[PDB]
Amino acid sequence: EDIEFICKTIGTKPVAHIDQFTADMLGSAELAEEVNLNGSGKLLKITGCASP
Amino acid sequence: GHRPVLVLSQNTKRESGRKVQSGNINAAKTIADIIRTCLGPKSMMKMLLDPMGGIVMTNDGNAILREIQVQHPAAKSMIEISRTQDEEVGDGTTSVIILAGEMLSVAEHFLEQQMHPTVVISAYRKALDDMISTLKKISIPVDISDSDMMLNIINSSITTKAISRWSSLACNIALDAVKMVQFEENGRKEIDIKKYARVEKIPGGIIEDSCVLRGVMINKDVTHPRMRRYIKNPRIVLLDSSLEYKKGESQTDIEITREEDFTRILQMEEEYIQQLCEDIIQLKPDVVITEKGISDLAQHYLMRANITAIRRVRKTDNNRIARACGARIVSRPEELREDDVGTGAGLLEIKKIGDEYFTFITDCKDPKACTILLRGASKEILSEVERNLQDAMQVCRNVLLDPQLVPGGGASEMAVAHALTEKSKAMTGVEQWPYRAVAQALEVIPRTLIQNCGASTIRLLTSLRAKHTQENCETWGVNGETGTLVDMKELGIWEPLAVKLQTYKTAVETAVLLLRIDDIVSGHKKKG
Amino acid sequence: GNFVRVTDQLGDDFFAVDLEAFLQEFGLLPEKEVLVLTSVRNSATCHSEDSDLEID
Amino acid sequence: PLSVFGDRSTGETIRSQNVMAAASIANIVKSSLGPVGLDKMLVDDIGDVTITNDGATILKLLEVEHPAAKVLCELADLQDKEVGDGTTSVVIIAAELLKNADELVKQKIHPTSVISGYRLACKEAVRYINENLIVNTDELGRDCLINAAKTSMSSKIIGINGDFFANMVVDAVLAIKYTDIRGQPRYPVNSVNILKAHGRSQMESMLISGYALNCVVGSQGMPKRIVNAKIACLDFSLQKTKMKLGVQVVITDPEKLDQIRQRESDITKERIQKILATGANVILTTGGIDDMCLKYFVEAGAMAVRRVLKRDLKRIAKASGATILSTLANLEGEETFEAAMLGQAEEVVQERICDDELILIKNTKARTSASIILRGANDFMCDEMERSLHDALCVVKRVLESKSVVPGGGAVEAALSIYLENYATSMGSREQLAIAEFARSLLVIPNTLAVNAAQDSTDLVAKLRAFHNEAQVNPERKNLKWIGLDLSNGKPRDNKQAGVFEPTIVKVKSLKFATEAAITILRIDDLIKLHP
Numbered sequence A: 001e002d003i004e005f006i007c008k009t010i011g012t013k014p015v016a017h018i019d020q021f022t023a024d025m026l027g028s029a030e031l032a033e034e035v036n037l038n039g040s041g042k043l044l045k046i047t048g049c050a051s052p
Numbered sequence B: 001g002h003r004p005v006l007v008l009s010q011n012t013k014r015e016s017g018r019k020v021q022s023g024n025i026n027a028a029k030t031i032a033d034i035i036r037t038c039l040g041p042k043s044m045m046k047m048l049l050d051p052m053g054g055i056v057m058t059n060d061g062n063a064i065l066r067e068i069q070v071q072h073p074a075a076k077s078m079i080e081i082s083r084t085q086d087e088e089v090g091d092g093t094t095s096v097i098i099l100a101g102e103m104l105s106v107a108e109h110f111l112e113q114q115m116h117p118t119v120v121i122s123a124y125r126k127a128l129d130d131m132i133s134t135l136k137k138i139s140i141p142v143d144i145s146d147s148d149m150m151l152n153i154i155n156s157s158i159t160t161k162a163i164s165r166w167s168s169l170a171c172n173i174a175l176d177a178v179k180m181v182q183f184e185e186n187g188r189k190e191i192d193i194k195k196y197a198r199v200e201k202i203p204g205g206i207i208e209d210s211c212v213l214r215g216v217m218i219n220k221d222v223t224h225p226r227m228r229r230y231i232k233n234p235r236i237v238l239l240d241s242s243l244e245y246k247k248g249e250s251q252t253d254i255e256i257t258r259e260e261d262f263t264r265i266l267q268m269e270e271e272y273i274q275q276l277c278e279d280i281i282q283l284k285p286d287v288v289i290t291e292k293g294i295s296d297l298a299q300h301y302l303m304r305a306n307i308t309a310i311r312r313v314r315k316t317d318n319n320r321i322a323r324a325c326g327a328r329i330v331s332r333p334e335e336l337r338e339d340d341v342g343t344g345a346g347l348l349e350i351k352k353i354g355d356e357y358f359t360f361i362t363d364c365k366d367p368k369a370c371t372i373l374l375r376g377a378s379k380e381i382l383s384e385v386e387r388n389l390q391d392a393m394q395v396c397r398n399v400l401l402d403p404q405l406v407p408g409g410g411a412s413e414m415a416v417a418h419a420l421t422e423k424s425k426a427m428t429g430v431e432q433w434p435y436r437a438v439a440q441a442l443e444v445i446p447r448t449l450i451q452n453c454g455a456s457t458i459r460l461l462t463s464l465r466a467k468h469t470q471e472n473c474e475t476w477g478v479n480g481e482t483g484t485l486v487d488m489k490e491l492g493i494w495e496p497l498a499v500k501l502q503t504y505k506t507a508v509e510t511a512v513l514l515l516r517i518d519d520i521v522s523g524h525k526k527k528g
Numbered sequence C: 001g002n003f004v005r006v007t008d009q010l011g012d013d014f015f016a017v018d019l020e021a022f023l024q025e026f027g028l029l030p031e032k033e034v035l036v037l038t039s040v041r042n043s044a045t046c047h048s049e050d051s052d053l054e055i056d
Numbered sequence D: 001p002l003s004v005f006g007d008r009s010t011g012e013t014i015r016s017q018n019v020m021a022a023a024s025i026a027n028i029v030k031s032s033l034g035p036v037g038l039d040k041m042l043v044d045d046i047g048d049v050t051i052t053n054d055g056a057t058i059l060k061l062l063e064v065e066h067p068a069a070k071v072l073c074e075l076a077d078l079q080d081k082e083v084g085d086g087t088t089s090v091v092i093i094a095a096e097l098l099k100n101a102d103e104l105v106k107q108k109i110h111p112t113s114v115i116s117g118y119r120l121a122c123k124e125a126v127r128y129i130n131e132n133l134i135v136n137t138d139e140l141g142r143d144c145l146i147n148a149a150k151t152s153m154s155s156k157i158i159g160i161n162g163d164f165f166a167n168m169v170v171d172a173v174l175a176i177k178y179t180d181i182r183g184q185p186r187y188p189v190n191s192v193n194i195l196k197a198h199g200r201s202q203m204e205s206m207l208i209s210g211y212a213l214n215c216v217v218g219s220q221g222m223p224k225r226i227v228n229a230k231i232a233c234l235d236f237s238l239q240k241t242k243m244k245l246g247v248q249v250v251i252t253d254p255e256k257l258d259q260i261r262q263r264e265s266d267i268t269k270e271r272i273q274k275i276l277a278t279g280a281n282v283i284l285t286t287g288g289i290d291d292m293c294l295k296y297f298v299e300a301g302a303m304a305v306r307r308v309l310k311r312d313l314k315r316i317a318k319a320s321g322a323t324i325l326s327t328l329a330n331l332e333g334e335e336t337f338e339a340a341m342l343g344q345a346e347e348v349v350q351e352r353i354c355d356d357e358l359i360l361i362k363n364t365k366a367r368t369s370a371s372i373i374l375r376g377a378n379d380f381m382c383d384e385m386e387r388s389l390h391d392a393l394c395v396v397k398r399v400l401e402s403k404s405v406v407p408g409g410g411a412v413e414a415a416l417s418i419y420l421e422n423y424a425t426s427m428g429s430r431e432q433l434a435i436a437e438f439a440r441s442l443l444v445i446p447n448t449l450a451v452n453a454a455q456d457s458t459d460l461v462a463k464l465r466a467f468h469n470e471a472q473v474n475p476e477r478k479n480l481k482w483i484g485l486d487l488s489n490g491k492p493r494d495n496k497q498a499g500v501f502e503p504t505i506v507k508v509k510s511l512k513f514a515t516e517a518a519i520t521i522l523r524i525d526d527l528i529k530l531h532p
Ligand SMILES: Nc1ncnc2c1ncn2[C@@H]1O[C@H](COP(=O)(O)OP(=O)(O)O)[C@@H](O)[C@H]1O
Pocket: B038, B039, B040, B041, B043, B060, B061, B091, B092, B093, B094, B095, B096, B156, B157, B159, B160, B408, B409, B410, B449, B478, B479, B480, B481, B493
């Protein structure tokens, strides 16, 4: 259920077969980093996206 | 139903204050009083009835305490202290409990007044450091190469047990077992009494016939009567893999369409067994020991080469045999090498004891493992004898690792108490009183020895204190059999420094741990 | 498991061996797993930032 | 009229109930505060015994039913997670704040005004702490870390042995130092493996210059000591090969079965042969090893350890420079093992510890690791040792990360109380009362400290307040901001000189969390308890 939101946010297009996996279906982002919340957990932030 | 508003649970019980401290101290005192009379050469044994129907007859503190189930957590802590003392050094189990009880009593004396427990704890730690220093000061070295002195040490260790009647035999058995199980490899020395030096008890016979074997004995018989039951200089091969055809890991269904495929499959099963047996035989051994099953066809093919086979041997027993006869356990028979064959066992013999067959490999040259064969009146007698032998072996290992020696019979207690009392005269603080009190609490060991001997506690203890006030009387203790003062360099009762250090450290830290508690909460769910 | 009046098929002097075998032969007792008899304790379970990391 | 299947409490009744629950939770642990506090011993329904001084452990083990009490317990847990120290202080402060706020509310002061005053007081207290009461650790040197560890370990089972344990903690923390991106040094605590073993005294606890494994060699035939170790870390089992669910073996020609069964183990034999041929001496795997592979390692004269924990294996691999391998598959489709995947250590030894054995990997190269083996009288004492040691490690990490410390012994609380009492007169009319009550409630820490020592709490707190008032009013008496409590003698003392330090983060986070919890509980004025 998160595929629509993720694709809208990043600009990626889902790939269901390796034959159609091409560079034009990737979502360019400025930074994809996993951060920790001072020992209270871990979050994965992808901040800065071409064509946001 | 009816809903009462609550913060904690209904079954949550909380108590705090002076009541908690007094309860902890009295629990420790009761635990000490349970085994107070089981200390000294004149100790009396106790019968413990197992919840499983067994009977334990012993005067060892650890067994008595472990057989008692208690509700007060302080008593649980004391029993854990007993187990820790048993596991660390293997001796002094009864002494540490009494020392902890006495220290907690003399601490309760101060807690009745307006002294905070932290002050008592700091004084106790200072006293513990001073006791360690004094014990290291009054110790004497031992010559491990001197067999007589080692036997004397083991004897003085076992004079307080039921096995003391056969003192020489027990001491020789323990010394020989510890010496031969001693090992050195890759620059790392080890003793490992737990794994090797197995004690096997066979009820019946006389205890004077008990001995330490120059090898390993197991309760096994040959797989088939045609096997040789007596081999002079056997070559032993040890295995884990079964000598029988077994299923593979993967699902391997067959599909037979031709007529001869069924008989062919059976013939190849037989051929695989024959190939395994031929691979074993290629090394030309005399005995084959396996931790798993051996097929009948495998037995036949081994007989064709005149090889005795024993199967279903425990892994620990097989490791012990490997250490004794100098063999290496091999899993795949096709990978057997010459150096894996065990040559060095000077005799293998399966003889019948009672109505059972026992396998003996008891002529090894330089064996690194042994079986202590114990024969006696019954099962409980042999269990007590095994416990005493375990104590003796632990003491021997402690002396071998640490060659320091400390006078016994309460002489060390009095010497340390006098040294601490003399040291306390130059502090002039509020901690001097608990320091002196815990110093004088060490006198509970000579007092217990005198009480168990049946002599006059007050007069003898006063005389011993007066003697220890002199200039060289650190080795003056009490004779636990006659109730008289005696010099321990003449009586000969000496103990390892490691045992005394562990006893004092454990007692002082038990007192410190139980002195830090003022609140008890119980009844809550485990939540996990 | 619906065992009632186990004394009928176990007696009054049954030991742990008898009960173990009796439960095994109906295949209700889980198989025995080999484990360390006693050792030292560690008492740790993952958590976060529990990772030594190379300096860079 | 409502016809709701449940119980309803509204107004002063529910407010007093919440305050009572919070006060009960506070009073549970108030006896375990400060160097003169004493431990508690908890017993489960199954007889398990826990002896502890940590507030978080006590509140986690306790079974709690009231929602406000649960809020306080989770507050203690959060303070433990985010800081690691000050778990009792935050609970006590939050409960006192709630009690004083309810006292204000009972005087027809609106709860919103109290909340606004509490927020203002917390913000100003944080600002005043950051601007006046912090001490930079640059001018103090290594002694600051030792003093912080000593202060943290007071009230613990290892307090008296602090002279030794503080050095151990500081060395352990400094051994795991690393710098991430941006050049900021980081101290990944919880990478210091802590092993507990009853036996010898506390003073004989060991700090390992390497790593300590709670594991033993797979087979008795392996050597127990290797000098120049070449550690190979594997993430896969070494057993007889078995095909997956999607692959099946069907035999039509009988002659192929023996070859199938032989290859079934020859695969693992070849893998182990490659691993040993690269030159490895020590093999650690998270999976199991069966007897045949154990015999291969025994014949090779190498140490093999099975069922190694994943975190332990990762720590060992990164400390020794090894790489975790979940498969021996390269980018060429082959099966190879390279010497570049081997870690190195100066020694790997299986040593005996109280009738039990553990593996020590000594002096790993390319990275320094640390492990601590705690020796105690029994299991409960070792557990309390471990908890106190973790507290000290967290405190030292906080001190090293943020280089600011604050004086202990209630000096910060007294200074904040005086400053906020002065400052309340310049803000509002009823938030003035709220800030004054915040300042008064901040004094519960020194009061509890003095009470635990059976000292005159009133007189000592009055003297401390007089000292701090003189410091704040007089301009050349700024050195009196460090005047705290000396509980041994029951007198005020310059705690900065005495070495009683705390990380600033502990105080700041405790204040913020306690204020938020108090606001959350104060926000309630009606409770509906639906029947289950
Ligand atoms: N012949 C003896 N005369 C006096 N004291 C002895 C004699 N033999 C042993 N002891 C004392 O008895 C103590 C041993 O008692 P024991 O029953 O072994 O208790 P534990 O198991 O706690 O050591 C030792 O401290 C030793 O000093």
